[PDB]
Amino acid sequence: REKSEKFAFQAEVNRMMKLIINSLYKNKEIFLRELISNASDALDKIRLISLTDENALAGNEELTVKIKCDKEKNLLHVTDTGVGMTREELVKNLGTIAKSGTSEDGQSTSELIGQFGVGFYSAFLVADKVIVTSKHNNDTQHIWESDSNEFSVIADPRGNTLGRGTTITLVLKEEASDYLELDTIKNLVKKYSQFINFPIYVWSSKTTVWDWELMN
Amino acid sequence: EKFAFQAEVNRMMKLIINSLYKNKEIFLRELISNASDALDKIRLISLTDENALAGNEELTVKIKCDKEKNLLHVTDTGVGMTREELVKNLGTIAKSGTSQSTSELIGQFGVGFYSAFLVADKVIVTSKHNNDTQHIWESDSNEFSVIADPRGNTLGRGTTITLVLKEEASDYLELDTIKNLVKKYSQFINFPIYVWSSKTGGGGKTVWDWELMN
Ligand SMILES: Oc1cc(O)c(Cl)c(CCc2nccn2Cc2ccccc2)c1Cl
Ligand SMILES: Oc1cc(O)c(Cl)c(CCc2nccn2Cc2ccccc2)c1Cl
């Protein structure tokens, strides 16, 4: 009975605070860095499952990140066609968020915090809720909402919208509405995506008509 | 408006640590663990300089309540801090009246410091390091000021953290339940933790002294 994980948990927690406060000094932009990173990792994951499964690309064939802004509603959407998440994985989340109403193995909370805690809690720099909608092969499509502390989860009323992958929805604060100005978000996505092997798109406009625009 | 960056560092630290620990009592776990670290630091130092513990030979943690004035004191005879360390503190508090190395400061001690503001409205650090004057440091997480102690070298070596508690948390001071949480969060520290409690030893007054808890 080792019981030395509450040391690695502490280390990962401390790395996490270092970076989130680091970002809060300057950019505030680390949430977007992590949003693109974790999307790419989930694209990296299912491309890597397509080399022992052949049916793996049967809910989608594209391997994309698609970012859409809802200026009016004040939402930020980052959709990918990666591996997705089963209801099981969504309730484990990053080991730290418990179901709504309770305040009373597997992969350890330590290593989840290491890869996911930074992107999760940094969202709350600019957002008030983060909503996760995701579809894995061999489970249905669910939605997951958290306030930083607790979560609830349901099956998606719209059935299977994504085919495969995840949509991260950031209910933004009004203070941070500037992040949905098409021009500030394009340059951000251009900047943080230049070393992604996958095509990353922002929903944009010409002259006036809207379509996806490749940023890398 | 005034302390915009300080207020946001506060909002974010409370949010993250409430999410991770779900227990406002974390503040006292951290109070005790950071005190144990100051003690191990001076302990290790003492294995190569024979005369390191000269300013104070005991290696303890001493917890005294003050239900009367709503103060909680945790005092360790660990390595202490220099005035320079006190003025760095965490890097996020501004020096009083002011209208990444600091990042790594929040890494090490931010949980321990900001958890104290779940439960209190002001934090006072009194410290004495080997080869430095003793100073008093105080902060409300926005501003901070540090002075030389007029009482002089009264700790000999080490640190006293003092939490001016919120009203919402006055409970933590009743000598019964404070003994419970120290017994809990310190059953596994490699240094003695004492609490100022009382007994009845003859027919007459009760007497206060150091009760041991580990
Ligand atoms: O930005 C993303 C893009 C993605 O495609 C995907 Cl799968 C994710 C989710 C990465 C993930 N896998 C397993 C656990 N977790 C962390 C997690 C789980 C539930 C809720 C919040 C975090 C993110 Cl965070
Ligand atoms: O609870 C404790 C018991 C101790 O013995 C000691 Cl040394 C500390 C302080 C740990 C520390 N070292 C260097 C910096 N800091 C953080 C800090 C510095 C000045 C003010 C507030 C925090 C704490 Cl927090």
- Is A25–B111 a contact, with Cβ atoms under 8 angstroms apart? no
CA dist B27 and B24 (Å) reads 7
- Is A25–B104 a contact, with Cβ atoms under 8 angstroms apart? no
Backbone φ and ψ of B212, nearest 5°: -95, 145
CA dist B16 and B110 (Å) reads 11
CA dist B47 and B9 (Å) reads 39
Give the end-to-end CA distance of chain A in Å, rounded to a whole number: 48
Residue B190 buriedness (CB in 10 A; 0-12 / 13-18 / 19+): exposed
Per residue in B118-137, is it b (16+ CB within 10 Å) or e — as a string?
bbbbbbbbbbbbbebebbbb
- Nearest CB neighbour to A17, from listed B16, B100, B102: B16
Query: Which uninterrupted H or E stretch holds B31?
Result: helix B26-45
Identity of residue B28: L
Residue B13 buriedness (CB in 10 A; 0-12 / 13-18 / 19+): buried
Query: Which uninterrupted H or E stretch holds B52?
Result: none
Query: Considering only CA atoms, which residue is closest to atom 21 of ligand 1?
Result: A93
Beta bridge partners of A68: A77
SS3 assignment, position A195: coil
| Cβ pair B19, A121 in contact under 8 A | yes
By residue count, chain B amounts to: 214
Strands (E), A29-90: 65-70, 75-80
CA dist A201 and A39 (Å) reads 12
CA dist A107 and A109 (Å) reads 7
- In angstroms, this model's resolution equals 2.9
Query: Considering only CA atoms, which residue is closest to atom 9 of ligand 1?
Result: A38
Q: Which of B34, B70, B64 is nearest to B169 (CA)?
A: B70
| Cβ pair A124, A30 in contact under 8 A | no
List, in order, residues 6 or more apart from B115 with CB less than 8 Å away.
B17, B21, B26, B27, B30
| Residues on B contacting A at a C-beta cutoff of 8 Å | 5, 8-9, 12-13, 15-16, 18-20, 22, 92, 100, 102-104, 106-108, 110-111
Q: What does B75-111 look like in DSSP terms, one character per residue? A: EE-SS---HHHHHHTTSSSEESS---HHHHHHHHHHH
CA dist A96 and A124 (Å) reads 15
Beta bridge partners of B61: B76, B193
Strands A210-214 and A200-205: what pairing? antiparallel
| Cβ pair B134, B172 in contact under 8 A | no
| Cβ pair A131, A172 in contact under 8 A | no
Beta bridge partners of B138: B124, B145
- C-alpha Rg value of chain B to the nearest Å: 18
Q: Which domains does chain B have, with CATH numbers?
A: 1-214 (3.30.565.10)
Angle ∠(B170,B175,B176) on CA atoms, nearest 5 = 105
Token digits for B176?
């019964």
CA dist A84 and A156 (Å) reads 14
Token digits for A142?
């669910």
| Residues on A contacting B at a C-beta cutoff of 8 Å | 13-22, 24-25, 96-98, 103, 121, 124-125, 148-149
By residue count, chain A amounts to: 216
Angle ∠(B76,B116,B40) on CA atoms, nearest 5 = 30
Report in angstroms the alpha-carbon separations of A96 from A33, A103, A148, B36.
Answer: 22, 12, 9, 26
Identity of residue B207: V
Q: What does A97-138 look like in DSSP terms, one character per residue? A: -EETT-----S-HHHHIIIIIHHHHHHTTTEEEEEEEEE-TT
Question: What dihedral do alpha carbons B73, B76, B77, B83 form, nearest 10°?
Answer: -80
Lining ligand 1 with CB less than 6 A are: A 35, 38-39, 42, 80, 82, 85, 89-90, 93-94, 116, 119-120, 132, 144, 165-166, 168
A124: left (phi over 0), alpha (psi -120 to 50) or beta: alpha
Binding-site residues of A for ATP, please? 38, 80, 93, 120
- Of all residues in chain A, the one with the smallest CA distance to B105 is A18
| Cβ pair A198, A63 in contact under 8 A | yes
Report in angstroms the alpha-carbon separations of B55 from B75, B80, B83, B161.
Answer: 15, 11, 17, 19
Token digits for A162?
């994504």
Residue B1 buriedness (CB in 10 A; 0-12 / 13-18 / 19+): exposed
Pick the atom of ligand 2 nearest to B109's CA: 16
SS3 assignment, position B131: coil
DSSP 8-state code for residue B168: G
CA dist B118 and B27 (Å) reads 8
Angle between helix A30-49 and A182-192 (nearest 10): 50
- Nearest CB neighbour to A24, from listed B9, B15, B22: B9
- C-alpha Rg value of chain A to the nearest Å: 17
A74: left (phi over 0), alpha (psi -120 to 50) or beta: left
Angle ∠(B210,B212,B214) on CA atoms, nearest 5 = 160
Report in angstroms the alpha-carbon separations of B194 from A216, B65, B106, B150, B162.
Answer: 62, 12, 29, 27, 16
Q: Which of B141, B88, B89 is nearest to B114 (CA)?
A: B141
Place of tokens 């992590």: A34
CA distance A192 to chain B (A): 21
Edge-to-edge strand order for the sheet containing A150-155?
A: A98-99, A150-155, A141-146, A127-135, A165-172, A75-80, A65-70, A200-205, A210-214
Report in angstroms the alpha-carbon separations of B164 from A3, A136, B70, B85.
Answer: 34, 51, 6, 22
Q: Is B131 marked within a binding site?
A: no
Token digits for A204?
């944009």
Query: Which uninterrupted H or E stretch holds B212?
Result: strand B207-212
CA distance A24 to chain B (A): 8
Question: What dihedral do alpha carbons A51, A57, A62, A68 form, nearest 10°?
Answer: -120
Q: Which of B26, B12, B3, B28 is nearest to B163 (CA)?
A: B28
DSSP 8-state code for residue B211: E
CA dist A74 and B92 (Å) reads 30
Identity of residue B120: A
